[PDB]
Design a protein around this ligand. Structure first.
Ligand code: 1PF
Length: 261
C-alpha cells in the first residue's frame, strides 16, 4: 500500500510499469478508482541540461494537447526543485510489447495504427519538433488507437513487469545538421516494416557494428517480399530511401493511396 500526492489529489500505486535513470512510471488509481499513469522524476541529482529537457518536454506536451488526440493526455503536473509528477492517461500496452507477442496482425488494424502514427508525428513536426529516436516503445495503444508518448526531448525509459539501433536513420550515422523531419519518416518506415513482415529491415544482422554499415551501404538492398497490399509495399520502399531528400515526406504519406484508399 503506497500512495502518490499530486496538486492535492491522492493516487494509489498498482504497479511500476517503467524506470529510467532518475524517472519512474507507475500505473495508479484515484479515489474514484479511475486508472492513470504517473511519471515521477527525481531532480536531486540532475544537471541543467537534464532539467531543461524535462521542462521543454512538459511544455510541449501541454501545448500539443489541443492540437491532436493521438498525443498522450497530460491532465496535471507538479514540478519543484526536488521532483516532477506527471498525471497522464494510462494505456493498455505499448506498441513494442504488443508486437513482441507476435501472433497475426490484421491489415485493417495495421493501417489504422499507421494513420495514428502519421497524425501524431505530423502534429509534432508542425510545431517544429523532430523526435529523431522513434521506436514502437514511443507509441501506446489506448481505446484501439495509437498515441505518441514522448517527443524525444527527455531521457528514454525501459519497461518493467538496452535500446535499439534498428530504427536509426542513415543521416544520423553519416553525421558525427542533417537531421530533419525526414529522419522520423525512416524510423516510422522501420516500425511499419516490423508490422508487415514481423521483423525490422536489419533484424537479420545480430551484430551491432555490421548493422550500422548496412543502413548507410547503398549496395545493401533492403528486401521487400511481395504481399497482397501493393500500396503498403510502396510506402515501405518510399520511407526506407537512404537519401533524405529522395525519401517521402509526412504530407506526401498522408495523401498516399495506402491511407486514403
Ligand atoms: C511491459 N509492459 C508495461 C506495462 C504495459 O504497457 C503499458 C501500459 C501503460 C503505459 C503508459 N500509459 N500512459 C503512459 C504515460 C507515460 C509513459 C507510459 O509508459 C512508458 C513505458 C512503459 C513500458 C514500455 C515502454 C514505455 C505510459 C505504457 C505501457 C504492458 C506491458
Amino acid at each position: 500500500n503506497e500512495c502518490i500526492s499530486v496538486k492535492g489529489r491522492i493516487y494509489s500505486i498498482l504497479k511500476q510499469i517503467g524506470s529510467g535513470g532518475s524517472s519512474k512510471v507507475f500505473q495508479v488509481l484515484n479515489e474514484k478508482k479511475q486508472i492513470y499513469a504517473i511519471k515521477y522524476v527525481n531532480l536531486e541529482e540532475a544537471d541543467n541540461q537534464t532539467l531543461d529537457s524535462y521542462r521543454n518536454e512538459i511544455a510541449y506536451l501541454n501545448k500539443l494537447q489541443q492540437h491532436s488526440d493521438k498525443i498522450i493526455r497530460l491532465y496535471d503536473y507538479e514540478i519543484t526543485d526536488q521532483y516532477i509528477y506527471m498525471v497522464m492517461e494510462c494505456g493498455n500496452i505499448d506498441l513494442n510489447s504488443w508486437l513482441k507477442k507476435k501472433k497475426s496482425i490484421d491489415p485493417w488494424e495495421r493501417k489504422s495504427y499507421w494513420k495514428n502514427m502519421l497524425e501524431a508525428v505530423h502534429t509534432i513536426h508542425q510545431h517544429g519538433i523532430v523526435h529523431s529516436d522513434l521506436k514502437p516503445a514511443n507509441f501506446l495503444i489506448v481505446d484501439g488507437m495509437l498515441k505518441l508518448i514522448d517527443f524525444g526531448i527527455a531521457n528514454q525509459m525501459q519497461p518493467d513487469t538496452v535500446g535499439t539501433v534498428n530504427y536509426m536513420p542513415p543521416e544520423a550515422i553519416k553525421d558525427m545538421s542533417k537531421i530533419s523531419p525526414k529522419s522520423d519518416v525512416w524510423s516510422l518506415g522501420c516500425i511499419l516494416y516490423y508490422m508487415t513482415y514481423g521483423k525490422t529491415p536489419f533484424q537479420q544482422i545480430i551484430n551491432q557494428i555490421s548493422k550500422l554499415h548496412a543502413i548507410i551501404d547503398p549496395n545493401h538492398e533492403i528486401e521487400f517480399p511481395d504481399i497482397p497490399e501493393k500500396d503498403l509495399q510502396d510506402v515501405l520502399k518510399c520511407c526506407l530511401k537512404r537519401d533524405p531528400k529522395q525519401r517521402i515526406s509526412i504530407p506526401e504519406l498522408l495523401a498516399h493511396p495506402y491511407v486514403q484508399i
